[PDB]
Write an enzyme that holds these catalytic residues in place. Structure first.
Site, PDB file in Angstrom:
ATOM      1  CG  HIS A 101     -12.201  22.707  15.067  1.00  0.00           C
ATOM      2  ND1 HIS A 101     -12.203  22.984  16.415  1.00  0.00           N
ATOM      3  CD2 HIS A 101     -12.749  23.779  14.460  1.00  0.00           C
ATOM      4  CE1 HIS A 101     -12.724  24.180  16.619  1.00  0.00           C
ATOM      5  NE2 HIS A 101     -13.044  24.695  15.445  1.00  0.00           N
ATOM      6  CD  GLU A 151     -16.166  12.310  14.744  1.00  0.00           C
ATOM      7  OE1 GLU A 151     -16.813  12.559  13.692  1.00  0.00           O
ATOM      8  OE2 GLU A 151     -15.964  13.153  15.660  1.00  0.00           O
ATOM      9  CG  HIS A 190     -13.195  13.178  13.054  1.00  0.00           C
ATOM     10  ND1 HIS A 190     -13.573  14.316  13.726  1.00  0.00           N
ATOM     11  CD2 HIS A 190     -13.907  13.171  11.899  1.00  0.00           C
ATOM     12  CE1 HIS A 190     -14.520  14.940  13.043  1.00  0.00           C
ATOM     13  NE2 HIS A 190     -14.737  14.265  11.925  1.00  0.00           N
ATOM     14  CG  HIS A 228     -13.245  16.575   7.988  1.00  0.00           C
ATOM     15  ND1 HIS A 228     -14.418  16.976   7.373  1.00  0.00           N
ATOM     16  CD2 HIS A 228     -13.626  15.873   9.080  1.00  0.00           C
ATOM     17  CE1 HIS A 228     -15.447  16.529   8.063  1.00  0.00           C
ATOM     18  NE2 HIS A 228     -15.000  15.831   9.092  1.00  0.00           N
ATOM     19  CB  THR A 285     -19.364  14.281  14.398  1.00  0.00           C
ATOM     20  OG1 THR A 285     -18.303  14.706  13.511  1.00  0.00           O
ATOM     21  CG2 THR A 285     -20.120  13.120  13.802  1.00  0.00           C
ATOM     22  CB  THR A 286     -17.701  19.551  14.748  1.00  0.00           C
ATOM     23  OG1 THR A 286     -18.123  20.011  13.480  1.00  0.00           O
ATOM     24  CG2 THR A 286     -16.595  18.546  14.582  1.00  0.00           C
ATOM     25  CG  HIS A 336     -16.339  12.245   8.571  1.00  0.00           C
ATOM     26  ND1 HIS A 336     -16.463  12.861   9.803  1.00  0.00           N
ATOM     27  CD2 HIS A 336     -16.558  10.929   8.755  1.00  0.00           C
ATOM     28  CE1 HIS A 336     -16.751  11.929  10.694  1.00  0.00           C
ATOM     29  NE2 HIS A 336     -16.833  10.758  10.089  1.00  0.00           N
TER      30      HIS A 336
END
Ligand SMILES: O=C(O)/C=C/c1cccc(OCc2cccc(CC(=O)O)c2)c1
Ligand code: NA
Ligand SMILES: [Zn+2]
Length: 258
Positions: free
Chosen positions: A62, A104, A94, A92, A196-197, A117
Site C-alpha cells: 500500500h 490526502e 501517500h 509513511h 485513512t486506510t 504521516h
C-alpha cells in the site's frame, strides 16, 4: 482483505468491509483555511525526535513504512492539542501519479504532490494495538510535500526504495533521523479523525503542518517506481495511494496560529 486503490477495490468500495468508512469522524478532510479558527488555548507543540531509533523499511503493498523502536520513550510528540505522550512507531507517505495530486488532506481544495504521516501512539494505552481502540489513541503528524528543491533528509529513504520494490520486501534502515523531514515552522491545524486506510478506525488526533516541505521531482519519481504487486507478479506502479477528502460532519478544525 484485498482493499487497495484501484477501480474495483479502492476508497469507494472500502465501506463494504469497513462500514466506519461512512462514520462521523473520517479522514482525510479538506482544510478550509478561512473557516479554521485560531485556538489560543492550544499549548505549544513538542516534537522530540533526538533519540529516535529507526529499524527497518517495509513495502506493505500500500505504501512503504519506516519503522521505529517504540519499546521506550525515545521519539515522542507532546503538547499542542495532545494530553500526555505519544510515541513514534512509523512513518509513511501517500503520493500521486502526477505532481498535481497525491496528498490526502487538501488545503482550500489544493492537493499537494504527497503527504507524510508520522504515526504516534498514546503511551497511556501501553501498545499500538490497544491505542487504536481508543478515541485519543493516536496522533498523526501530517506534512505536505511539494515538488521544487530536493529535501536532503529524504534522500536516504529514496535511495533504499530500489531494494524494496515489491510488496513484502523489507530492508534494514537503522540510524535514520526523521528530524530531517520537518519544515521550519510547526504552525498547524488540528481536528479529530481516523486512519485513512482500512480499518479506518476513529482513533486519531490529526496535526497537519501548514508549511510544506519541498522535495525534488527526482525524489518523488522514485516513489512512483515502487510496486503495489509482489515479486514475479504483473507490475502495478505504486501511485495514487491516497484517500480523497471525507465529509467534515460535526467537526471544527483549529489553527495554532493567527
Ligand atoms: O492486518 C490486520 O488484520 C490489521 C491491521 C491493522 C489493525 C489495526 C490498526 C491498523 O493500522 C494500520 C495503520 C497504521 C497507521 C496509519 C494508517 C492509515 C494511513 O495510511 O495513514 C493505518 C492496522
Ligand atoms: Na485549489
Ligand atoms: Zn497515511
Amino acid at each position: 482483505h484485498h482493499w487497495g486503490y484501484g477501480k474495483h477495490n479502492g476508497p469507494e468500495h472500502w465501506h463494504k468491509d469497513f462500514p466506519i468508512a461512512k462514520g462521523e469522524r473520517q479522514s482525510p478532510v479538506d482544510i478550509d483555511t478561512h473557516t479554521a479558527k485560531y485556538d489560543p488555548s492550544l499549548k505549544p507543540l513538542s516534537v522530540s525526535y533526538d533519540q529516535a531509533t529507526s529499524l527497518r523499511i517495509l513495502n506493505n503493498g500500500h505504501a512503504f513504512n519506516v519503522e521505529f523502536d517504540d519499546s521506550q520513550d525515545k521519539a515522542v510528540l507532546k503538547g499542542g492539542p495532545l494530553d500526555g505522550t505519544y510515541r513514534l512507531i512509523q512513518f509513511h507517505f501517500h503520493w500521486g501519479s502526477l505532481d498535481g495530486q497525491g496528498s490526502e488532506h487538501t488545503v482550500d481544495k489544493k492537493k499537494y504532490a504527497a503527504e507524510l504521516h508520522l504515526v504516534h501512539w498514546n503511551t497511556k494505552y501501553g501498545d499500538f494495538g490497544k491505542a487504536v481502540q481508543q478515541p485519543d489513541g493516536l496522533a498523526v503528524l501530517g506534512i505536505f510535500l511539494k515538488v521544487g528543491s530536493a529535501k536532503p533528509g529524504l534522500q536516504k529513504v529514496v535511495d533504499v526504495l530500489d531494494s524494496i520494490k515489491t510488496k513484502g520486501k523489507s530492508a534494514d534502515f537503522t540510524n535514520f533521523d526523521p528530524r530531517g523531514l520537518l519544515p521550519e515552522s510547526l504552525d498547524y491545524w488540528t481536528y479529530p479523525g481516523s486512519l485513512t486506510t482500512p480499518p479506518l478506525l476513529e482513533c486519531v488526533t490529526w496535526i497537519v503542518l501548514k508549511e510544506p516541505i519541498s522535495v525534488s521531482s527526482e525524489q518523488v519519481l522514485k516513489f512512483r517506481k515502487l510496486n503495489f504487486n509482489g515479486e514475479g507478479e504483473p507490475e502495478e506502479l505504486m501511485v495514487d495511494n491516497w484517500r480523497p477528502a471525507q465529509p467534515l460532519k460535526n467537526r471544527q478544525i483549529k489553527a495554532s496560529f493567527k
